[PDB]
Amino acid sequence: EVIRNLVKRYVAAMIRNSKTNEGLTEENFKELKQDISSFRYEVLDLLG
Amino acid sequence: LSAEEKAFLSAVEKGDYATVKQALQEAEIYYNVNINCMDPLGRSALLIAIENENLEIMELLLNHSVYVGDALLY
């Protein structure tokens, strides 16, 4: 009953620390570039 | 978690204002999905709409009877 709580708030603290402490990289840049690119071709395909 | 509860918690974190609102209007008509449904790591739909800074899904949830408890700190 204690270990379940410690594991649960441990894993919550570690995903929190991965959100705060991970610096951005090139593949995260490619994800935004494909989101704007794919949304671009989708809007151009609806308006064409 | 149900598959429709995961469909609602995957409707949020994507930024939908249509399928989230349709799920919150189906929640009133039928008791199909509880709005206060957690992820496997805590994480209610309100907290998902807080980590992604979207105020429209926050107003859309807070217009409904979502459990707001201890979510202002997040």
From Swiss-Prot, chain B:
Belongs to the transient receptor (TC 1.A.4) family. STrpC subfamily. TRPC5 sub-subfamily. This is Short transient receptor potential channel 5. It comes from the Eukaryota. Forms a receptor-activated non-selective calcium permeant cation channel. Mediates calcium-dependent phosphatidylserine externalization and apoptosis in neurons via its association with PLSCR1. Acts on distinct neuronal populations in the hypothalamus to regulate innate behaviors including feeding, anxiety (flight/fight/fear), socialization and maternal care. Homotetramer. Heterotetramer with TRPC1 and/or TRPC4. Each subunit in the homomeric ion channel (via ANK repeats) interacts with one copy of GTP-bound GNAI3; the interaction is direct and activates the ion channel. Interacts with TRPC4AP. Interacts with SLC9A3R1/NHERF. Interacts with MX1 and RNF24. Interacts (via C-terminus) with CABP1. Interacts with SESTD1 (via the spectrin 1 repeat). Interacts with PLSCR1. Interacts with PKD2L2. Disruption phenotype: Conditional deletion in oxytocin (OXT) neurons in the paraventricular nucleus of the hypothalamus increases anxiety, impairs sociability, and causes severe hyperphagic obesity, postpartum depressive behavior and reduced maternal care. Expressed almost exclusively in brain, in mitral cells of the olfactory bulb, in lateral cerebellar nuclei and in pyramidal neurons of the hippocampus. Very low levels detected in liver kidney, testis, and uterus. The gene is Trpc5. ANK repeats lie at residues 2-32, 41-69. It comes from Mus musculus. It is found in: Cell membrane.
